[PDB]
Structure 1
């Protein structure tokens, strides 16, 4: 039967490590796909780790150009959480260089975008097969979440973006029951930009903390109602959470407009807590090093910069990167509330390191109502490989 996911998010004080896959380290000798954009989604029987292969394996000649971002070889697959993206445990999901996924209690729903950049198409899947499609509507990279979409009482919603990586673009929400689309919406956000949102269910509504790739060093936020009515803005916080980003002291929070002088970013996330918010980010303000998460007092509703809880999961001497959200189903956590969790992508090799390849590993952290000590659960691989 169907999953409700209508409870608010639980109020945690810290996150405990769920898993760690050791994708890369294990790949020096194992048969592991070369990937990127990994994320985590859960059903009422298990959580799985979805990723985007490069139709190749680590420590092999085919892992060469693996930095480009797109190719016809990129395919969306998955494996039980914590397990590495190896070839022998992989479940084929779909053909994509940009995906998202979520389960609604009964079956999984996947969306893999692939094809030419001026005419890419999104193949929606449900129950082991594609059921519906969405063609690029602005002829210019029809991307998406690169993270767990969201299902509430049977209806699963997600976000998509067609446009430049810089200047203004076009966004849209998507709502669908059992793999068949059922209406969507065009996000009005002139001057504001949005990409790869790390959503999650909360209070019977969908909340996302996306990524402005145009001008914002602060992230845009967006609450989606079931009838497609929505709200869009930016984490109010007085602290920046993008990368690259200006300093905490030189940044002024903003609930409606983007801020900071930076035209590039990185996927990221944030959880709503009362009017408070837990916001993740890479410690090193310029590169993709280390990963830290912060709970600014009142941050979701005020421009607050009042900190009172900080914990590192990746120190600044370790490659980090992407990081999305998702929740544990009540049919697993057992809580009376949606336990919030997130993952951290730990990229390696190019661009940052001298290697002919690029890939990443992931680490899964999870709510809990106990303050967790700072530590580093970094990749570990010894670069370069048998290159």
Structure 2
């Protein structure tokens, strides 16, 4: 049967470690795929870790220019949370250099985008076979979440972008049932930019905190209703959560527009808590190093900067990077609410380190109604490798 996922997100006080794969450290001797963009999504029976491979293995010559982000070898696959993205326990998902996945309660639906930049094709799979397709509608690197999509009562949703990484681009919302596309919407967002949305379900609607790679150091937000009507804007909090970004003291919040003259970014996330908000971010304001999640009072509806909680998951002497959302299915947690969880990607190698390769590891954390002490569950791999 289908996963209702109509409950509201659980109000958490802190997050506890769920897993840590140690992908890279292990890959020193083992046969581990070189990856990037790992993320978590759950079925009502287990949670899996999805990832994009370079079709090559750690400590091998094919892991060379594995920094480019795209190639015809790039593939989407998965293992159960905590397992390294190793070859012998991996499941093939889709041919992709950009993906998103989610389970509706019956089967898994994946979306892998591959093909030429000017005419990429996003193939949708369901139950292990392709079912529908979305062709590039703006001829410029069609891309999606790199995080778990969202399924509410059988219908699954996700966000996609097509256009430049700087100036105005084009964004759309997609909705599907059993792998077949059943609706779509264009998101009007002039002056704003949207990418790599980290979504989760809350009170029957789909909430996402994305990435503005054009001019925003604060993150865009969009509440998608089942009928595809929607509300787009920015995380209200008077604190920036993208990288690169300026100081918090130099940042005035804004619920409607981007702020700060930073034109880059990194995939991040946020969880609504009533009117409050749990927002993650790299400790460093310039580099993808360290990770922390802050809970801002009324930070979801106000330009508030009233911090009530702060928990470090990767200190600032260690590499971090991408991070995304997903929720624990009620059939697994037993709760009456949707337990909010996230993962932190820890990128190793180029561009920051002197190695011919680039891959990443991940740590997973979940909701919990207790204050969790600060610590650093960093990658821990020793570079360079037999390079």
Structure 1: state its 5+ residue gaps: none
Aligned equivalents of 2:185, 2:8: Cα separation in 1: 24
Aligned equivalents of 1:57, 1:272: Cα separation in 2: 38
| Deviation, structure 1 residue 123 | 0.3
- Cα deviation code 1:218-240 (max 9, x no counterpart): 00000000000000000000000
Aligned to 2:364: 364
Three-state SS of the structure 2 residue aligned to 1:332 is helix
Three-state SS of the structure 2 residue aligned to 1:249 is helix
Aligned equivalents of 2:70, 2:53: Cα separation in 1: 11
Aligned equivalents of 1:249, 1:304: Cα separation in 2: 12
- Cα deviation code 1:289-329 (max 9, x no counterpart): 00000000000000000001000000000000000000000
- Cα deviation code 1:34-91 (max 9, x no counterpart): 0000000001000000000000000000000000000000000000000000000000
- Cα deviation code 1:191-229 (max 9, x no counterpart): 010000000000000000000000000000000000000
Aligned equivalents of 1:256, 1:241: Cα separation in 2: 15
Aligned equivalents of 1:19, 1:333: Cα separation in 2: 16
- Cα deviation code 1:78-106 (max 9, x no counterpart): 00000000000000000000000000000
Aligned equivalents of 2:134, 2:257: Cα separation in 1: 30
Aligned equivalents of 2:166, 2:306: Cα separation in 1: 31
Aligned equivalents of 1:53, 1:217: Cα separation in 2: 29
Aligned equivalents of 2:157, 2:122: Cα separation in 1: 14
Asked whether 1:87 is paired with 2:115, we answer no
Aligned equivalents of 2:308, 2:212: Cα separation in 1: 26
TM-score by length of 1: 1.00
- Cα deviation code 1:166-215 (max 9, x no counterpart): 00100000000000000100000000100000000000000000000000
Aligned equivalents of 1:103, 1:87: Cα separation in 2: 23
Structure 2: state its 5+ residue gaps: none
Three-state SS of the structure 2 residue aligned to 1:362 is strand
Aligned equivalents of 1:127, 1:360: Cα separation in 2: 28
Three-state SS of the structure 1 residue aligned to 2:250 is coil
Aligned equivalents of 2:362, 2:38: Cα separation in 1: 7
Three-state SS of the structure 2 residue aligned to 1:125 is strand
Three-state SS of the structure 2 residue aligned to 1:285 is coil
Residues 337-352 of structure 1: matches in 2 within 5 Å? 337-352=337-352
- Cα deviation code 1:328-352 (max 9, x no counterpart): 0000011000000000000000000
Aligned equivalents of 2:163, 2:305: Cα separation in 1: 32
Aligned equivalents of 1:14, 1:262: Cα separation in 2: 30
Three-state SS of the structure 2 residue aligned to 1:233 is strand
Aligned to 1:115: 115
How many residue pairs match? The answer is: 387
Three-state SS of the structure 1 residue aligned to 2:198 is coil
Aligned to 2:55: 55
Three-state SS of the structure 2 residue aligned to 1:62 is helix
Aligned to 1:11: 11
- Cα deviation code 1:14-49 (max 9, x no counterpart): 000000000000000000000000000001000000
Three-state SS of the structure 1 residue aligned to 2:24 is helix
Aligned equivalents of 1:175, 1:107: Cα separation in 2: 16
**4+ runs deviating over 4 angstroms:** none
Asked whether 1:66 is paired with 2:66, we answer yes
Aligned equivalents of 2:157, 2:33: Cα separation in 1: 29
| Deviation, structure 1 residue 375 | 0.2
- Cα deviation code 1:220-276 (max 9, x no counterpart): 000000000000000000000000000000000000000001000000000000100
Aligned equivalents of 2:121, 2:84: Cα separation in 1: 28
CA RMSD of aligned residues (A): 0.3
Three-state SS of the structure 2 residue aligned to 1:199 is strand
TM-score by length of 2: 1.00
Aligned equivalents of 2:63, 2:294: Cα separation in 1: 35
